[PDB]
Amino acid sequence: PQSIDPLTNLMYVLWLFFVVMAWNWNCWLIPVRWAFPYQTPDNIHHWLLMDYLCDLIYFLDITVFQTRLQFVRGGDIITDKKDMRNNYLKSRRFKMDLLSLLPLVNPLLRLPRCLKYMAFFEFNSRLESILSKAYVYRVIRTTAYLLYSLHLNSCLYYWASAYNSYIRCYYFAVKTLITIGGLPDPKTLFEIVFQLLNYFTGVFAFSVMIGQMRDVVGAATAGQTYYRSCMDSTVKYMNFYKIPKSVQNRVKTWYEYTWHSQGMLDESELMVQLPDKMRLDLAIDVNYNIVSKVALFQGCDRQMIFDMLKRLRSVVYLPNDYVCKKGEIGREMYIIQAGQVQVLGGPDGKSVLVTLKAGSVFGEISLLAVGGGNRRTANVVAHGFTNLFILDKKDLNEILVHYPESQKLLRKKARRML
Amino acid sequence: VVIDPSGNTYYNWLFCITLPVMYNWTMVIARACFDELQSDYLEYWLILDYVSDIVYLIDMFVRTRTGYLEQGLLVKEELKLINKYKSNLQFKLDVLSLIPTDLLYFKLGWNYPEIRLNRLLRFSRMFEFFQRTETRTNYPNIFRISNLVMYIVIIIHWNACVFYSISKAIGFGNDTWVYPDINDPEFGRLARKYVYSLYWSTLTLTTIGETPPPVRDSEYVFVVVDFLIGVLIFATIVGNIGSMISNMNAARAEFQARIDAIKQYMHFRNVSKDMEKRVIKWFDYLWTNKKTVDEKEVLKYLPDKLRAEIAINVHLDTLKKVRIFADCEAGLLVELVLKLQPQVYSPGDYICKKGDIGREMYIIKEGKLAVVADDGVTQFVVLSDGSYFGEISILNIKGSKAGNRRTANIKSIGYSDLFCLSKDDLMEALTEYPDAKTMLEEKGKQILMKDGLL
Amino acid sequence: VVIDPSGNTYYNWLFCITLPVMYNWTMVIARACFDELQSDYLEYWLILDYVSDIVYLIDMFVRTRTGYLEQGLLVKEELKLINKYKSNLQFKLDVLSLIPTDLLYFKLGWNYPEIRLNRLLRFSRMFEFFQRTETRTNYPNIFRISNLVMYIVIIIHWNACVFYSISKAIGFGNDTWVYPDINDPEFGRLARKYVYSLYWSTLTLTTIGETPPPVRDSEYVFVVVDFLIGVLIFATIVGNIGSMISNMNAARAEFQARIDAIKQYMHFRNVSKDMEKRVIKWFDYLWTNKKTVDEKEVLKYLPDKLRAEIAINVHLDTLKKVRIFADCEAGLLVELVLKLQPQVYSPGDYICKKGDIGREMYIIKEGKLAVVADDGVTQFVVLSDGSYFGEISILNIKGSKAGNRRTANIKSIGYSDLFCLSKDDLMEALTEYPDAKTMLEEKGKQILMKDGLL
Amino acid sequence: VVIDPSGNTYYNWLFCITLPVMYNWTMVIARACFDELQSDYLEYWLILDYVSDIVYLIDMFVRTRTGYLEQGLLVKEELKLINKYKSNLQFKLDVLSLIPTDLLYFKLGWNYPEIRLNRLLRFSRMFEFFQRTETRTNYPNIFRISNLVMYIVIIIHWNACVFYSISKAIGFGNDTWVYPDINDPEFGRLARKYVYSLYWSTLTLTTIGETPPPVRDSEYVFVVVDFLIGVLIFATIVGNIGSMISNMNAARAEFQARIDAIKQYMHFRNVSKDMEKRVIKWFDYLWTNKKTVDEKEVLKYLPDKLRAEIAINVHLDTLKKVRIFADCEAGLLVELVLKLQPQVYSPGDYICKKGDIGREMYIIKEGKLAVVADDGVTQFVVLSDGSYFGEISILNIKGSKAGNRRTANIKSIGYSDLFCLSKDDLMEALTEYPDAKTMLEEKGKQILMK
Ligand SMILES: COc1ccc([C@H]2Sc3ccccc3N(CCN(C)C)C(=O)[C@H]2OC(C)=O)cc1
Ligand SMILES: Nc1nc2c(ncn2[C@@H]2O[C@@H]3COP(=O)(O)O[C@H]3[C@H]2O)c(=O)[nH]1
């Protein structure tokens, strides 16, 4: 990669994870070396070797990774070194990267090495975008923050103790996270100010833990709560008006099938939050092939097809549900997106004259009637649950007034057929 | 024979397999750690483990029997169901739960129940049952509290078992932190063992609780691990309960936000005090009778067939009693009944006055109305549920002496919940039935000629 | 004679029945567990119990006498109300609560006042009163937190009584965990007994590990169960307070989110800093003067009749002041009131200029306008409250000069709230009034030739 | 002169009146409970309380001089301001707060500071200052945390003073719960008394009683009440911090919720993988460059006047560059500015193809568009910021080879944000102007030959 893009091509995410591990080393292993005596002369070379490895990772990220990042200027992707280097230099990220490698035996000289926190936030955003159920990683990240707060408290307690032995100070830090009693009693105003500050910081960490857990629970169960509230409102409405249990059970069964299959309970309310180009290109990659397969819409303008694609509403039909009865008015074009549909024949119905699978279109001739001319010539039932994309005749009428040539051609088709 | 997942037999089997899964999850580690629990009740544990294994095999059989939906249709072919079950990770977990690992009792002694921990791999069936009955139960919050309580009980019990195991490994009575000597007359009892370990794990999963401090580094590491595990678990529990309280108070908060917004608007726009008393009384009526949400936002996700079915089952007997809609096609009745939108009128409200536009037909679903004079003191005739008016105002009748005008004053005697059908809604519903359009025109013609309004 | 459940008398009786219900729910278990509390004040407790039973009988009489909304009307038939009450779970709960168990004293002595625990079964009255209080008080959050605090106090009192009863069953002074020996002069006092039980219960529910450690298995079991109860209590308090805090600043958080969206839009679109300052000052004015509500969004939560009657109470008095609308149909004026759209203008803002399109007329409710020249600093006249302009620019007068064009420069001296009646809305409301339309055209043109135009 | 409540000087005076109010709400109770504190610095407290009452009186004068937006204007008549102040409960509170209770010092002695507890009735002014700070600072969450911490410290200090008062009423050294004997030189120091009381209060409220146990019944009652106060304090802190977390990440939660919804929609509808990656890439670009919420959604909360001034500032400078709209009247120009609506386009999206009907004119503001014919990779010409296309098709030119039809394919190499103006929105805006409609038709007609 002569110029890596920060969004995709997850090798950059792997390198940024390595930078995050280096920054986590510079965050965690610095106070435990400042307070606790694991920076002995016997193993000083290991600490210096790993610290210099982290510094090399920092310098490598500054030089050969952050410089060759594709960047958008005026909305255009820009992928040349002479502009990427200047764009990186102008950013605050390079300022923090330079400040995080200022060289100043004391590990507090490596205190600015923890100042590369923008790389951690970028890696957090990328790991959130990569994997579904990102609330698990949010829980892990908040837990890591609380462990780091307890680690800093443990190092501070060990440093103040002189004025394993690490897990003991950690136990004292967790025990005094929301408790001030474990700490020794204050005889001055200054000491009670720091004791109150310690208590408040620990309670802030604990309440961030609790609030992030509440946030994760609410976000992970927001859709379930919304679906349950909608179902309970519908059930309360049907119970208020004394709806019999057959229609209530049909409405319920529709609710569980729509929630388990679609997972949103309304696809149309999601589309209106998308850009119109998103809506159009999503309607193309779902129904354009099926709509363009029919011979009634062949030879028509592509924009008329595109406009009918936006107005195609997805409706779920329960098992053994009459999509259109014999003699019922015809004003819709049913496109079987999924499921089995049965056109019935024989004596008194109940015999499948023909069955149609997903991707077939029937009832389009009902789109061309004027003044309710078309009647459904055969009984049609839904074999099992089926998702049909439906276009109303009125919706076609609103579409056709914007395309006079297409409307005239479709009216010629209507005159030729019927 | 195929058991559908959305039925009740699948629910009963989910409970009947959850009971051995719960027994395993709460007793395998208990018998593994507390040796007297395993040893003293050996025969009972053997019988219960054999029962759990039999129910595990029957659940594996049910997994083959249960039918997934393919193209919205339930699969009843045996080979397809078996392949769908075996392709998933659940089959691997089920077959790993049923290794013949009870034969290690001969090779490890009767005091090693940790060999049966593979039966814990049926946790997914327990979670499936819990999430199925969370939606099924009438009280979701109460059962969610029950699940949270059961989860913390299981976690506290597991920490108690691990604490007893660590005290066994370190040595009983070796430190003031471990469980005391089991040669004591009062501390050697198995009931005292488990219950004191449960109390210790209760004190240790919360940092606030005071326990004898750890002595050596292993105890400190274990106590820190319990501290952070309890932080995670109890933060999750408090977040769950806070989310429940937010959910149960969300409707009240939305209603109170609407009420306060309307109060702020009336104070801002200097609305007269009697009118704001009327508005607040209306809102108290709405909250008292639990009518805060309108049916437009209730039946908004339902399909046209289901909204139509509810509309028939509410208004067909009322709408077919109308003279004009008597000899009408049922399809027009279905199309028209979807457009009946409700309006609720306070007592003393004038639905329509003489001199107003007739563009809506009002059907009294619930409530009593009255035809009153201009002063409104006297009542001409009372109307109850099942009645209708405005039938000729919406009908475009040419040459009417009193066209598009209310010929009487309608006053709401009480809180009347009545459904209006707009004139434009009916004319847009009549673009599909021109024969019914001229039929209704003829009906209005004879109605107006009966009363001489032409 | 009937009592309205939405009236203030019903709320007063809800308080008057909540007092004996609260008295029972606390003092029955208090006397049951503290025997010295029941024995010493037996003369007072019998009188208070008889008073509570009398209020229970009167509550039964009121619940027979209270009415419900059948067909929107309060039922005034005594037999119908009695059969409605009897065919309810509340009647069963009340009759179970009012079974005379005070005769059981004669079987068990005066030392057993838990025989009247059935009087606790009137909890529904207490819950209804505390649910009907928050919906009528001006401090919903303060009453909610006080109600939660009182519920926690009741649970702490109950757990204190349970702890004292457990200590009594085990024996006072047997070990450290229980209440100490009651033969002690200091700890044997009844007030000391209750307050140390309350202190122990608060240390057992609100926190953990600060009580004396348990000794026997039942005590550890009680401590673990109380820990579960207390962590549920703590999570309930945290969730209620968090929902309350989120609800108090829900409007502030939403307004700040809208401000931040506006600010990032103007940062991304790179508008002038003067426009940025004007937008920030506008939002500061909007928040400071309690104007943050969106009028359409607030009024869409009202019924059509109620929203129309709000608008009539707001706009009809000033729309009659309009010269062309001074003598018009009441329905026309009401419909034109319903079509009025609010706008708010900053000081120094130009509503219209000489040459702009005269599409809508403006009716001033709050604020003062200025008619200015081309420079904009010279003052011709000032339009005060209730004034109107552009009333002829929305009328399609044939052949008149300056058609749909503004003939003056209008600016806002301060903040002005103006409701604008558009030409399109006027034509839409006038499509059912041809005579009023042509009479409005007649009045407008007669105004025009009066001033020398057309 | 009338001071504007929205101005910075009103905030400055709010701070300078909050300082004596915060002084009275914290120090008066400490003087009342710690009698040694009152006796030691009586000379300091006399002048300090006198100047606090002076600032209270000046605040009352400012309340008579502060303006309110009557009828959309800041009224400056002094009589109306005085009547508005006196008709409010704030005047009653300020009068009760300025009762000269310091004149009662000659009767009950100098060891009773609790008589001037009426000075706490100016708490509404301090709360007003804090609620104005919450809507003014650039760190609302940090200020909310600091305000909550200050409230908790104030409650802790008040409870410490109440504990010292209870110890004084019972008697110092009477038992192990109360403050020890003040005759002890180590425990007789004023600083040591206040610090030990403060630490006892912190232990009792925050840790729910790590303090030595109560001995008397009143001590048990006080400790139980403090336990309830402390659990309410802890729940208030946790709930406030959770609400702060929700308020900070509500936008991210909504964006991730819509990403999850569209991902579930694409996975359920069998949307092709390339389209799915394009959608996620598009939403990541929207979140990264801070253009998430739609322009209509963002600006729909604004009034029509201020939104019009915003739109004119953004789009009118690029609209006069249009050949047909260069020499038109200003009213039609601003109407077309308000009528045009944004459209975002990902790379590889064709805005319009050849043979398509020209329903709307597109003007590019932030984009690098190209014109391609048939093949789609020809790149005949590249249009950068400030350009436009489709103006020929929207105009109903009398005689055209491609009647209301596009002439070439349009592609976007990168992400482009460009504003569309429909033909219907142009026709409705051109009904009010006959002369400008004729001028536009004539000017558009005379450009089709080249
Ligand atoms: C840091 O590790 C900790 C892990 C668990 C806790 C428990 S202890 C407890 C026990 C009973 C009732 C209430 C509590 N309290 C409040 C105690 N005081 C602060 C008022 C908590 O906070 C509990 O936590 C939860 C999230 O419910 C504490 C600390
Ligand atoms: N009558 C009939 N309809 C069929 C058959 N196969 C498919 N269909 C479709 O079923 C539809 C039922 O409604 P329509 O009569 O409008 O149109 C019909 C056709 O689109 C068939 O064999 N007979």
Ligand SMILES: Nc1nc2c(ncn2[C@@H]2O[C@@H]3COP(=O)(O)O[C@H]3[C@H]2O)c(=O)[nH]1
């Ligand atoms: N004028 C009149 N209307 C009545 C009477 N009884 C019922 N109504 C209905 O009240 C309705 C009011 O509106 P319309 O004038 O449209 O139609 C009226 C009739 O449908 C009556 O006795 N006189």
Ligand SMILES: Nc1nc2c(ncn2[C@@H]2O[C@@H]3COP(=O)(O)O[C@H]3[C@H]2O)c(=O)[nH]1
């Ligand atoms: N030019 C002018 N207009 C006034 C005066 N007083 C009121 N107006 C109104 O200001 C209005 C501005 O819009 P119009 O031109 O439609 O109509 C104008 C008049 O109705 C005045 O003294 N001079």
Ligand SMILES: Nc1nc2c(ncn2[C@@H]2O[C@@H]3COP(=O)(O)O[C@H]3[C@H]2O)c(=O)[nH]1
């Ligand atoms: N035909 C053509 N149009 C171009 C070219 N470059 C830019 N355009 C513009 O792209 C526009 C697309 O819509 P129109 O056909 O209305 O008008 C077209 C031209 O204004 C080009 O090279 N050939």
